[PDB]
Amino acid sequence: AQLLAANEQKFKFDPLFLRLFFRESYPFTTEKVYLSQIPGLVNMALYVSPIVSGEVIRSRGGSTSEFTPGYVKPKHEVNPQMTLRRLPDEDPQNLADPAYRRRRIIMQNMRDEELAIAQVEEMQAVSAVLKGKYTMTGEAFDPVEVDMGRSEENNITQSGGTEWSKRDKSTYDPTDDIEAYALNASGVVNIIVFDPKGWALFRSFKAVKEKLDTRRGSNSELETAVKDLGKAVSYKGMYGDVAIVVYSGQYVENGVKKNFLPDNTMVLGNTQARGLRTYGCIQDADAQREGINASARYPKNWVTTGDPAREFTMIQSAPLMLLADPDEFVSVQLA
Amino acid sequence: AQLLAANEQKFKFDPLFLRLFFRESYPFTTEKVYLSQIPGLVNMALYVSPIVSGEVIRSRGGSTSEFTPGYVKPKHEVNPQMTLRRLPDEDPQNLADPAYRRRRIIMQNMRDEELAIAQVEEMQAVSAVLKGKYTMTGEAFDPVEVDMGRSEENNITQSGGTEWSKRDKSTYDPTDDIEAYALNASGVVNIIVFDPKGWALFRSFKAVKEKLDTRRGSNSELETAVKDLGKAVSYKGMYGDVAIVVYSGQYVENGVKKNFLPDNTMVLGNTQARGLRTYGCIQDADAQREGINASARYPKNWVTTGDPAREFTMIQSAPLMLLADPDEFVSVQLA
Amino acid sequence: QLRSWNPPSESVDAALLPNFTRGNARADDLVRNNGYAANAIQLHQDHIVGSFFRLSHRPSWRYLGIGEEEARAFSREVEAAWKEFAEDDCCCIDVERKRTFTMMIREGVAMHAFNGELFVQATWDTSSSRLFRTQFRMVSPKRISNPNNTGDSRNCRAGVQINDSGAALGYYVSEDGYPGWMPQKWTWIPRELPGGRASFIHVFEPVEDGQTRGANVFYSVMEQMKMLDTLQNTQLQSAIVKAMYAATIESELDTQSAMDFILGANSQEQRERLTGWIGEIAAYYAAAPVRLGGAKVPHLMPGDSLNLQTAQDTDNGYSVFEQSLLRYIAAGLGVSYEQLSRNYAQMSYSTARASANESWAYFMGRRKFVASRQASQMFLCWLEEAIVRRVVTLPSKARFSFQEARSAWGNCDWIGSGRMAIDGLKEVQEAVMLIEAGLSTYEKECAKRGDDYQEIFAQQVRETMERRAAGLKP
Amino acid sequence: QLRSWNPPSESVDAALLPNFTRGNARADDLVRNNGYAANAIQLHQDHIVGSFFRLSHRPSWRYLGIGEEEARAFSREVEAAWKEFAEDDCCCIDVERKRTFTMMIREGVAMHAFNGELFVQATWDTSSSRLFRTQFRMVSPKRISNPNNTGDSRNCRAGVQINDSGAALGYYVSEDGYPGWMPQKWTWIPRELPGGRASFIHVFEPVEDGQTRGANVFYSVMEQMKMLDTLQNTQLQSAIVKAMYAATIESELDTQSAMDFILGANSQEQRERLTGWIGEIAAYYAAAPVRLGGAKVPHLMPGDSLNLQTAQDTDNGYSVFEQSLLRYIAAGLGVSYEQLSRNYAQMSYSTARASANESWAYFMGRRKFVASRQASQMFLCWLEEAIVRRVVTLPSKARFSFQEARSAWGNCDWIGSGRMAIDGLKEVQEAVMLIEAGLSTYEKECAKRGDDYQEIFAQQVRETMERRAAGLKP
């Protein structure tokens, strides 16, 4: 059992979703998300006559304001019985210390913990901006469908009508489809991040390959983001006007591993779409009596006396991240 | 016979395999490798309901946990009868000293020793990520095949069907094959390191030569790695999206020398693939009674009294380095 | 056990500096967890400085040609000035503004005892509440590392920049680490100014040539750590197992071949026999209430019991082990335990006064060895400032200038703890013999008594005249 | 045990020099890991030098024809000059610029105790802060090896170049090794200049003729090393096994022939019997909870237990072993342990004063044996420099020149630690007897008291006149 302050990572490397589209964090002192409580977009046009001023403007009463945040509280043991991750030859005598082994093993345990919540949050993000629906579900828990409201024109499919696979691999240009799906996106699209084989049949067209610019032509901080997360986001290059990226991230589930992304999917939208990170109550007596009922995360190291007389690291959170405008992204399944 | 502390090199220059893919060292106090004991990838998804928490999570019991580490303990003599490597004109009077000759000759002897174990470890690495099989073998020792489990789609061959040699040297683009072999690699490939003639027939295609960028466009620390090991890794340049490297390292065997790499081979995978460096027991009474049973290497300088009344330098190790995900790399024999 | 603590075979400086951080850190651990270090530093304080540390200025009048009377009057002036400057009640003589001269000497001697070195810096305060704008800020030993924690180098060695000959030029002071999140930045600090000004007073005892750091404590205290641990654990085990008791139930039963055949038949297909016997024994323990005392006998159906046969039963010997080792390390570390934890066992008269006089002379040794440096350095800086400010007047016939003969002019001695009392009869017979034979001078008499001859004579004049006036007996 | 430490059978010099590095290295190991060496060197310091080391110049006035009064006044001048030159407050008298005369003597005596030799070098400092341009830099014993670490030769022997007759001509000083990566280069250093100038003061005690190095410590301390190890380990084992306890489970079962037949049938084809019995015993331990205390009884199905029958159980005897051996090596190495770790066991009055006076006289022996060499050498160099600078005036009637009679002119004695106190009554009855019978002179009285007759008389004059003036009683 070590203090709360032993929670230093400086490792925030989420794959460009919770850090770039979903910056809009709202931890609450209350259980649910109350979209009426969030101001979101403000009623933002009307003025008043040059004699007096008008009424009082409020948070404009969101129609649906009741969903259950994913209160996730996992834990692990940091029992000093293992040989640990030994960074090359930094004096294993301190590993021989139970104190250093226990502290850096709580380091390792907790980092596994937040990357676990981060990967489940990224699955929530990919569900969110791929269908507008999120499955708040788990065993011994009712499945609540949390819908931002993704429209039908945001779910139009490439296989409908003519498929890119069922097209000329040399002369056909899918740019026409690119603006066709981008027009009904309530904004400009500046990233065309694909799943791998989706980008494969996208680039199979020649027009794509002599239309794209392999050069840097550094447009924004997206190159810096790729250099940071050189793991699963791949900056293919410029398609001229728009940036071409491929995400091949993978989640390692209970017995097997598989990619986050489905077979062939796309979301057309902006890099500055508004993403909410509403956070529920944290059900920990420590959190309430020290005021961490409204926060992002909560770690603790703590000893059980009695039957499971041991010591554990416990991580608690409650995210219900969504997208403010589901119509911002057009979600297309590809050929 | 000089003390243990006379083992200072600061020379770690392994060819980008044990330092970049196989950082994951696990020296043990026990003979074999117990993959069940290594946590490896942790069961890393499930949370618990917001009422109580669930069961205890363990190291998820690796199916096969019994292989024999390559306990390698060679030695040499440092008999002060030679004229040694004389660095240009740093006062050969100290070479005339038996003390300085003996100490810098144990320096030379031991450095030969760890570079020997490093080169045999690199042969183990090239066997590992070229077929998923490693031959734990030697005379007066049973040959144990240590298999990570490389799949068949990770062993698909270029000569099957149409060969790059049996293709148009001007218009054919092997990029199609590049993503064809990269898709079933469980991740993104960012180095296309070839053996020399493999890269030769790769670049024989024009599309390759006007698709590749000879410029620096410094992507990562791989340029720094090449500047460090300017010996046998050759940073050809950018192929645009991916880095092009060629390894032409050579091992000098008992009577002859020959390249590490086979004639025409390729492994498609990431630069951050997980590589285990499990290490067995060190069978040296000194090592046990001072606790170096679980370590990387062990040197010693020591005198034999009696029939071989001499003095030797002895180096002991026991590596059984493997790859966590054999499916991470697709191994292809080329045209 | 030699595993968790390892000596290399080399010169002491190169055997300590590589493991400087670990040894010092475990020294911090033991001086924080253990009372012995606190008692030792407290007794060192009370033997070396005690109540106060008194300055006495004795310029080399004979060598400089200065008259002894002029030297004595000039010393009177400087002593009055120094006492009034040191007695500042607002703790204002330090840059930290929270330590007087007493705690200057206190922290300096404590840190020169722990790490073997002390670091004083003569800085120019701007607070005009006093005539003297010089304060002395003490510098932590954690600050002295090579610029940006680099390992030892050719001439930059553990934070000190020296020449090939070893001459300490300056130092790289890392930035403070309190709060625990300030980064360290290394700043240049010369040891002394060329004109002899003592800027960075670095006083340490080097055991050998070229050594840069002082002596440790933990590297001889790990054995108390592990002896206290082992005695603690062995007393715990002895206490818990003097009356540990196994409460099981056995029965006659046990018909050898019949019991084995029944067990085998149960294992194969006749578990109903075991179920019936277990039911009968459960009914047995629920119709008996098999209870020994205030507690229930733990449920044991017949045929199984613990075999708590023990190990050897000789006396632990820890008694004479611990007396021998406490003895041992007591006049190892130096201060005897018959007062570091105060035994009164079989101690006698010659015992007492021999031990007391040798230990007190040895503390006089440590005092004159590790206090006079700081005293003289601080006095030199203060006297230089006083000469700058023309507070006290140098002799007109100065054979050498102040800057040239700072050592000659600033020659001084210092008085530590007060008047020693051990026996009474001892000190008084010594005093009567010295005062009858004249074998004691002003200076060494005042050293022995912790007083001043001038003031004792003036106050005896006052005594005699008040007794005469009031009618008492001089 | 004689394996890890081996004496050859030969003259001591040729039996030590071949194993010089190993013995000295393990000596470093024990003096660093062990407190006894620190306590011994500290007590040697405080008995030999103590507070200070006082010079007294007595030129052979009777033999040289010099008047005693002129000799005494010239001695007054040289003593004033030497004290003012030695009292330098900036540590500036050394080339390292960090040791005064006190630590000159300290490091010299410490190294002449450890290695048996000390190495001083009279160098010409250029720092003009003092009148005397001569400093004295001490030279490490690691420096003295044959040029480029070659083995002993005909006349180049362990670093000293001598003749066939053994006369020490000069030395090969290897370059310093701090930081731990400087190479060594050997430089020529003569022992003394032809004119009698003491350049390289090499003071060592040779046990026999032709010996070049001094005495060791470790070659008689390995036995403390291994006794402390063995007592340490035996106390650890005794503590850990006073209450080691085996918690297994046995049962009746065990139908001899039936059990053997069942085991054989299981080995052949009937392992189902063993599986059934193991299942029954697992259900047994999970329906009993077989638990002894706060901890679970380690799982033992019936028929297997540890046999922790012990070895002999007599007292270890280590008590009287260790007292006898501490006794033994205590007045081996020389300083008694009843203060090297301070026992007060059954020690009596004659005990105390006999032990104290013999030990103190013996320290007077060591002082006069291994301090006066360095004192006279340094005094000769300083006096030669003073004569060069015309600081003090030689007698006009010099029967021999300074350069010719440096020994006669530079004849000197030195005073070590201060006034001994052991009993009080002892010293005072001695003092009264000496002062009544006149059996004590100025010189030996001042030697006994650590004072000066001239200053005691001048201060008694001051005492009497101040008592008369202020009204006190002379």
CSV table of N, CA and C in Angstrom, one decimal, chain B residues 20-98:
chain,number,residue,atom,x,y,z
B,20,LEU,N,16.9,-3.7,-30.7
B,20,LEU,CA,15.8,-3.0,-31.3
B,20,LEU,C,14.5,-3.9,-31.3
B,21,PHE,N,14.6,-5.1,-31.7
B,21,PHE,CA,13.4,-6.0,-31.7
B,21,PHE,C,13.4,-6.9,-30.4
B,22,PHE,N,14.6,-7.2,-29.8
B,22,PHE,CA,14.6,-8.2,-28.7
B,22,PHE,C,15.2,-7.6,-27.5
B,23,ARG,N,14.6,-6.4,-27.0
B,23,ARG,CA,15.1,-5.7,-25.8
B,23,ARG,C,14.6,-6.5,-24.6
B,24,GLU,N,13.7,-7.5,-24.7
B,24,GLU,CA,12.9,-7.9,-23.6
B,24,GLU,C,13.6,-9.0,-22.8
B,25,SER,N,14.6,-8.6,-22.1
B,25,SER,CA,15.5,-9.6,-21.4
B,25,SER,C,14.9,-10.2,-20.2
B,26,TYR,N,15.0,-11.5,-20.0
B,26,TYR,CA,14.5,-12.2,-18.8
B,26,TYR,C,15.5,-13.2,-18.3
B,27,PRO,N,16.6,-12.8,-17.7
B,27,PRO,CA,17.5,-13.7,-17.0
B,27,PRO,C,16.8,-14.3,-15.7
B,28,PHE,N,16.9,-15.6,-15.6
B,28,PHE,CA,16.2,-16.4,-14.6
B,28,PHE,C,17.2,-17.0,-13.6
B,29,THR,N,16.7,-17.3,-12.4
B,29,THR,CA,17.4,-18.1,-11.4
B,29,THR,C,17.2,-19.6,-11.7
B,30,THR,N,16.5,-20.0,-12.7
B,30,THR,CA,16.1,-21.3,-13.1
B,30,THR,C,16.6,-21.7,-14.4
B,31,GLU,N,16.8,-23.0,-14.6
B,31,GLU,CA,17.6,-23.5,-15.8
B,31,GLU,C,16.8,-23.1,-17.1
B,32,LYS,N,15.6,-23.6,-17.3
B,32,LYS,CA,14.9,-23.4,-18.6
B,32,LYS,C,14.3,-22.1,-18.7
B,33,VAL,N,13.6,-21.9,-19.8
B,33,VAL,CA,12.7,-20.8,-20.0
B,33,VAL,C,11.3,-21.3,-19.8
B,34,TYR,N,10.5,-20.5,-19.0
B,34,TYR,CA,9.2,-20.9,-18.6
B,34,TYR,C,8.2,-19.8,-19.1
B,35,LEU,N,7.8,-20.0,-20.3
B,35,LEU,CA,7.0,-18.9,-21.0
B,35,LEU,C,5.7,-18.7,-20.2
B,36,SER,N,5.2,-19.7,-19.4
B,36,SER,CA,4.1,-19.5,-18.5
B,36,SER,C,4.5,-18.5,-17.4
B,37,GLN,N,5.7,-18.6,-17.0
B,37,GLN,CA,6.2,-17.6,-16.0
B,37,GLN,C,6.3,-16.2,-16.5
B,38,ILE,N,6.8,-16.0,-17.7
B,38,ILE,CA,6.8,-14.7,-18.3
B,38,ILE,C,5.4,-14.2,-18.4
B,39,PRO,N,5.1,-12.9,-18.0
B,39,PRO,CA,3.7,-12.4,-18.3
B,39,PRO,C,3.5,-12.2,-19.7
B,40,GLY,N,4.5,-11.8,-20.5
B,40,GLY,CA,4.3,-11.5,-21.9
B,40,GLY,C,3.3,-10.5,-22.1
B,41,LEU,N,2.3,-10.7,-23.0
B,41,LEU,CA,1.1,-9.9,-23.1
B,41,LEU,C,0.2,-10.3,-22.0
B,42,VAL,N,-0.4,-9.3,-21.4
B,42,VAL,CA,-1.3,-9.4,-20.2
B,42,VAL,C,-2.7,-9.5,-20.8
B,43,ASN,N,-3.6,-10.3,-20.2
B,43,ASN,CA,-5.0,-10.3,-20.4
B,43,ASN,C,-5.5,-8.9,-20.1
B,44,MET,N,-5.9,-8.1,-21.1
B,44,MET,CA,-5.9,-6.7,-21.0
B,44,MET,C,-7.2,-6.1,-21.6
B,45,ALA,N,-8.4,-6.5,-21.2
B,45,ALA,CA,-9.6,-5.8,-21.7
B,45,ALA,C,-10.6,-5.7,-20.6
B,46,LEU,N,-10.9,-6.7,-19.8
B,46,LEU,CA,-12.2,-6.8,-19.1
B,46,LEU,C,-12.1,-5.9,-17.8
B,47,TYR,N,-13.3,-5.2,-17.6
B,47,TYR,CA,-13.5,-4.5,-16.3
B,47,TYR,C,-14.5,-5.2,-15.5
B,48,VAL,N,-14.9,-4.6,-14.4
B,48,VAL,CA,-15.9,-5.2,-13.5
B,48,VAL,C,-17.0,-4.2,-13.3
B,49,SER,N,-18.2,-4.7,-12.8
B,49,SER,CA,-19.4,-3.9,-12.6
B,49,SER,C,-19.2,-2.8,-11.5
B,50,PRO,N,-19.9,-1.7,-11.6
B,50,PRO,CA,-19.8,-0.6,-10.6
B,50,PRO,C,-20.4,-1.0,-9.3
B,51,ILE,N,-20.2,-2.2,-8.8
B,51,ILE,CA,-20.7,-2.6,-7.4
B,51,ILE,C,-19.5,-3.1,-6.6
B,52,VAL,N,-18.9,-4.2,-7.2
B,52,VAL,CA,-17.7,-4.8,-6.6
B,52,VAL,C,-16.7,-5.1,-7.7
B,53,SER,N,-15.6,-5.7,-7.3
B,53,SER,CA,-14.6,-6.1,-8.3
B,53,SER,C,-14.5,-7.6,-8.4
B,54,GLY,N,-13.8,-8.0,-9.4
B,54,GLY,CA,-13.8,-9.5,-9.8
B,54,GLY,C,-12.6,-10.2,-9.2
B,55,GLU,N,-12.2,-11.3,-9.9
B,55,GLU,CA,-11.3,-12.2,-9.5
B,55,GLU,C,-9.8,-11.7,-9.6
B,56,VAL,N,-8.9,-12.6,-9.3
B,56,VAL,CA,-7.5,-12.2,-9.4
B,56,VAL,C,-6.9,-12.6,-10.8
B,57,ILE,N,-6.2,-11.7,-11.4
B,57,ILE,CA,-5.6,-11.9,-12.8
B,57,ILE,C,-4.1,-12.3,-12.6
B,58,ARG,N,-3.7,-13.3,-13.3
B,58,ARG,CA,-2.4,-13.9,-13.2
B,58,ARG,C,-1.6,-13.7,-14.5
B,59,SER,N,-0.4,-14.2,-14.5
B,59,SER,CA,0.3,-14.4,-15.8
B,59,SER,C,-0.4,-15.6,-16.5
B,60,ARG,N,-0.9,-15.3,-17.7
B,60,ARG,CA,-1.9,-16.2,-18.3
B,60,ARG,C,-1.3,-17.5,-18.9
B,61,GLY,N,-0.6,-18.2,-18.1
B,61,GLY,CA,-0.3,-19.6,-18.3
B,61,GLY,C,0.1,-20.0,-19.7
B,62,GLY,N,1.3,-19.6,-20.2
B,62,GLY,CA,1.8,-19.9,-21.5
B,62,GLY,C,1.8,-21.4,-21.7
B,63,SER,N,1.3,-21.8,-22.9
B,63,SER,CA,1.0,-23.3,-23.1
B,63,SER,C,2.3,-24.1,-23.1
B,64,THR,N,3.4,-23.6,-23.8
B,64,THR,CA,4.7,-24.3,-23.8
B,64,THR,C,5.6,-23.4,-23.0
B,65,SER,N,6.2,-24.0,-21.9
B,65,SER,CA,7.1,-23.3,-21.0
B,65,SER,C,8.4,-24.1,-20.7
B,66,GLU,N,9.0,-24.7,-21.6
B,66,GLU,CA,10.1,-25.6,-21.4
B,66,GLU,C,11.0,-25.7,-22.6
B,67,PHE,N,12.0,-24.9,-22.7
B,67,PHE,CA,13.1,-25.0,-23.7
B,67,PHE,C,14.4,-24.8,-23.0
B,68,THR,N,15.5,-25.3,-23.7
B,68,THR,CA,16.8,-25.3,-23.1
B,68,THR,C,17.6,-24.1,-23.6
B,69,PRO,N,18.0,-23.1,-22.7
B,69,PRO,CA,18.8,-22.0,-23.1
B,69,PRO,C,20.2,-22.5,-23.6
B,70,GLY,N,20.7,-21.7,-24.5
B,70,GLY,CA,22.1,-22.0,-25.0
B,70,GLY,C,23.2,-21.6,-24.1
B,71,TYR,N,23.4,-22.4,-23.0
B,71,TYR,CA,24.4,-22.1,-22.1
B,71,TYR,C,25.8,-22.2,-22.8
B,72,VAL,N,26.3,-21.1,-23.1
B,72,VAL,CA,27.6,-20.9,-23.8
B,72,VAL,C,28.6,-20.5,-22.9
B,73,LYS,N,29.6,-21.3,-22.6
B,73,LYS,CA,30.7,-20.8,-21.8
B,73,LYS,C,32.1,-21.1,-22.5
B,74,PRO,N,32.5,-20.2,-23.4
B,74,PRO,CA,33.9,-20.4,-23.9
B,74,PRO,C,34.9,-19.7,-23.1
B,75,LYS,N,36.2,-19.9,-23.5
B,75,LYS,CA,37.3,-19.3,-22.8
B,75,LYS,C,38.4,-19.1,-23.7
B,76,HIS,N,39.5,-18.4,-23.2
B,76,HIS,CA,40.7,-18.3,-24.0
B,76,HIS,C,41.9,-18.1,-23.0
B,77,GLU,N,43.1,-18.1,-23.5
B,77,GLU,CA,44.3,-17.8,-22.8
B,77,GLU,C,44.7,-16.4,-23.1
B,78,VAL,N,45.3,-15.7,-22.1
B,78,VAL,CA,45.8,-14.4,-22.2
B,78,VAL,C,47.3,-14.4,-21.9
B,79,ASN,N,48.0,-15.5,-22.2
B,79,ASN,CA,49.4,-15.8,-21.9
B,79,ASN,C,50.2,-14.6,-22.4
B,80,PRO,N,51.0,-14.0,-21.5
B,80,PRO,CA,51.8,-12.9,-21.9
B,80,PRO,C,53.0,-13.3,-22.8
B,81,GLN,N,52.8,-14.0,-23.9
B,81,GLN,CA,53.8,-14.3,-24.8
B,81,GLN,C,53.7,-13.6,-26.2
B,82,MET,N,52.6,-12.9,-26.4
B,82,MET,CA,52.3,-12.3,-27.7
B,82,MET,C,52.7,-10.8,-27.6
B,83,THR,N,53.1,-10.3,-28.8
B,83,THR,CA,53.0,-8.9,-29.0
B,83,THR,C,51.5,-8.6,-29.4
B,84,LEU,N,50.9,-7.5,-28.8
B,84,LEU,CA,49.5,-7.3,-28.8
B,84,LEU,C,49.1,-6.3,-29.9
B,85,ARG,N,47.8,-6.0,-29.9
B,85,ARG,CA,47.3,-4.9,-30.8
B,85,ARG,C,47.9,-3.6,-30.2
B,86,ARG,N,48.8,-3.0,-31.0
B,86,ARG,CA,49.4,-1.7,-30.5
B,86,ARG,C,48.7,-0.6,-31.2
B,87,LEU,N,47.7,0.0,-30.5
B,87,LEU,CA,47.2,1.3,-30.9
B,87,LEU,C,48.4,2.3,-31.2
B,88,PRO,N,48.3,3.1,-32.2
B,88,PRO,CA,49.4,3.9,-32.6
B,88,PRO,C,50.1,4.7,-31.5
B,89,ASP,N,51.3,4.2,-31.2
B,89,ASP,CA,52.3,5.0,-30.4
B,89,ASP,C,51.7,5.5,-29.1
B,90,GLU,N,51.0,4.7,-28.3
B,90,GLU,CA,50.8,5.1,-26.9
B,90,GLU,C,51.7,4.3,-26.0
B,91,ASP,N,53.0,4.8,-26.1
B,91,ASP,CA,54.0,4.4,-25.1
B,91,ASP,C,54.2,2.8,-25.0
B,92,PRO,N,54.8,2.1,-26.0
B,92,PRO,CA,54.9,0.7,-25.9
B,92,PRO,C,55.6,0.2,-24.6
B,93,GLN,N,56.2,1.1,-23.8
B,93,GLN,CA,56.8,0.7,-22.6
B,93,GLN,C,55.8,0.0,-21.7
B,94,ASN,N,54.6,0.4,-21.7
B,94,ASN,CA,53.6,-0.3,-20.8
B,94,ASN,C,53.2,-1.7,-21.4
B,95,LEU,N,53.2,-1.8,-22.8
B,95,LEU,CA,53.2,-3.2,-23.3
B,95,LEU,C,54.3,-4.0,-22.9
B,96,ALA,N,55.5,-3.4,-22.8
B,96,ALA,CA,56.6,-4.2,-22.2
B,96,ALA,C,56.4,-4.6,-20.8
B,97,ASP,N,55.5,-3.9,-20.1
B,97,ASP,CA,55.0,-4.4,-18.8
B,97,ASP,C,54.2,-5.6,-18.9
B,98,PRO,N,54.5,-6.7,-18.2
B,98,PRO,CA,53.5,-7.8,-18.2
B,98,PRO,C,52.2,-7.4,-17.6
